[PDB]
Design a protein around this ligand. Structure first.
Ligand SMILES: [Cl-]
Ligand SMILES: [Cl-]
Ligand SMILES: [Cl-]
Ligand SMILES: [Cl-]
Ligand code: NA
Ligand code: NA
Lengths: 369, 369, 77
């Protein structure tokens, strides 16, 4: 469009004869997401909801991606094994890690999903040490309305990283920031949605109430939904993972949607209030295998491509069969090296764009019981 | 610092023998600004308060900087003259505009203040037309805690511009975003502070309550102050400026600190509640000349370099004498071309860094009446 | 307002409150005034004569929402 060709008709709130007051008022009333954020970006964006995923980012590991090679980990493996709490499965194997990364990318390509690649500097560091956990790009997933700078609860190696990913998203995709979390703890990228307007959080090492309130207030205003609901799990876990029980600080390890009103769910996830809410709202629960969960095979860390189709860890045999039994297609992907730190396959995927999908009303209206 | 030289002692919350819970809790308790935002940026930043200004940005005008040369202005001068409401003083003169820009920069340099320069693309445009008002870099001033994406109330030509300036600040200065305003209207960069923890807003074309609440909640958490106060003016004005009265939608045209508990103030600014609050809190008021105000010479659009020293428009002779009479040094700078649109000298300065300065308690404790 | 609302002979009673920028009775720099009767007055059903120094944004919004037509007084007068 030519620079001298612009006319008043190109301003949506303009109309012939409008008064100053009326024009200003119309401007105050405009929707941020659809008037400002998306037009200025030149595109739609946000991973909210349970609709069709179209666009993600992965990190291809280098030696610096390996948590067990940080000088601080070498100084005290037990300090980090406390924070993370995941079972010890041996040193990370860089080459096998690279191979399961390729395998995941091929699965995305075979399912029509665009994959961006994120690289970090050589010898990447924040003010407090080598980066750690920076393979887990879910921590930088993009919301309707924009990116988020997180307050990490347990992993100091992620300081600087949500900034890096949000800046990457702005420079590479033109996607703006929505909010920085500035109190408590909130790691929104490890949360998941079970309907278009329903968010699952935890109260845990990774989330306190003040952090949660700050995040939810920001994303609810750009959610593109009339209502916004937060289901809050209350897992019994000190750090990230409780290897005695399978309980986890992160929603994405506790629960995930597999279809409209169908969830895969950990045995260590649901307190009575959470169970009641899910019952009242007509959600069908597929319980993950208890051993797969407790051993941290991440059977609930599935990535919903669209209602009825998920990527899952190939060795979660029992949970995956239960998912298929519930009518859901499973794309099996190797995910073993990734689980030597605090996450699985879904945890390592930065979600950029998911198309609007089924609503809580849809879930409530499904006749199944 | 070497990549393999990092130790646990370099994590502030770490100490020998700390439990997982205790380490996580210490991390949840850390101050965002001083633990995360500033260390990750590698510097301090924010224009909050009335302390010593050290760092700003200006825009050197090109033909595209001129509001009266937008194709939309050419289509209807009266539409934009409605929105802005400033007196017609003739076409903007590009060369004279460039010269008063140089003069302002020289004043900064002579006062030990670093000046960055911001350029826009050729033929700069947002989704709704040519940029307009983008010389007014105050709209991108940086807060303690980070940058802000604004919701402009009256000027569609500024859509995209607060984004551009915040992205510039991140890429050029490594200064992160704090928040996007996503409801109503809020133009925080045109607000001013009259003590370290006291912000002046308006309710006007440029600010509604919902926008205000969103902004204040965000900046109060990173303010670095125990309390945070918002004085809210209620000017009688439809657009930006009321040429019958001198009333203005923007705080920076209504009022500004010139020293500790000394303010320059428009005759059209103070309703009874605002007057009462200022009286109770021991603020001395220097009233701007009524004619200078009403004619939009911007006598309150002074820039505080530090308590007791301001830059002011050279032709605000009467207001400037009153400022000198109140013991304040005035640096007179030409500012005539700038005032053909919605702002003066302070309005065109992006403030990046101001050192912490006097508090509300300081103001209250000054003995003067 | 509490006293006059009880004898108003009306189901509801509303108070629109202007917030003029004036120290005493009158601000000769602006035309702002401490008294409503100098700021605004009805001239017909939902038609008001109104000073340029009278209406803050909230007052303007309320009058707009309630369908009042504003005739602006001459600024010099
Ligand atoms: Cl109107
Ligand atoms: Cl768009
Ligand atoms: Cl403890
Ligand atoms: Cl620092
Ligand atoms: Na916020
Ligand atoms: Na009485």
């Amino acid at each position: 469009r030519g620079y001298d060709d612009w006319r008043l008709s190109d301003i949506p709130q303009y109309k012939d004869g409008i008064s100053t007051y009326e024009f200003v008022r119309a401007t105050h009333e405009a929707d941020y997401r659809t008037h400002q954020a998306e037009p200025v970006a030149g595109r739609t964006f946000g991973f909210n909801g349970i609709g069709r995923l179209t666009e993600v980012a992965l990190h291809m590991p280098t030696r610096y991606t390996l948590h067990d090679q940080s000088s601080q980990y070498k100084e005290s493996p037990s300090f980090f094994q406390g924070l993370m709490g995941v079972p010890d499965r041996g040193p990370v194997d860089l080459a096998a890690f690279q191979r399961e990364t390729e395998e995941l990318a091929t699965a995305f390509e075979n399912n029509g999903i665009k994959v961006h690649w994120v690289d970090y500097p050589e010898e990447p560091a924040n003010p407090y040490g080598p980066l750690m956990g920076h393979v887990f790009l879910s921590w930088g997933s993009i919301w309707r309305g924009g990116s988020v700078i997180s307050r990490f609860g347990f992993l100091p190696g992620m300081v600087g990283v949500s900034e890096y990913l949000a800046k990457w998203a702005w420079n590479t995709l033109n996607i703006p920031p929505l909010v920085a979390i500035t109190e408590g703890a909130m790691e929104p990228g490890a949360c998941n949605m079970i309907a278009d307007e329903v968010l699952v959080t935890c109260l845990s090492a990774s989330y306190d109430q003040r952090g949660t309130d700050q995040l939810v207030a920001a994303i609810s205003k750009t959610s593109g939904t009339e209502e916004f609901h937060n289901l809050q799990l209350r897992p019994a876990v000190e750090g990230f993972f409780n290897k005695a029980t399978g309980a986890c600080a992160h929603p994405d390890i506790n629960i995930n949607a597999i279809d409209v009103g169908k969830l895969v769910v950990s045995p260590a996830a649901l307190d009575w209030d959470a169970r009641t809410w899910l019952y009242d709202n007509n959600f069908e629960l597929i319980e993950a295998d208890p051993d797969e969960q407790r051993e941290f095979l991440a059977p609930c860390n599935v990535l919903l491509l669209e209602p009825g189709k998920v990527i899952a860890h190939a060795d979660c045999h029992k949970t995956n069969q239960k998912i298929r039994d519930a009518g859901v297609e499973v794309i099996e992907v190797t995910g073993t090296e990734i689980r030597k730190a605090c996450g699985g396959i879904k945890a390592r995927v930065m979600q950029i764009n998911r198309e609007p999908g089924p609503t809580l009303a849809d879930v409530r209206n499904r006749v199944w019981r």
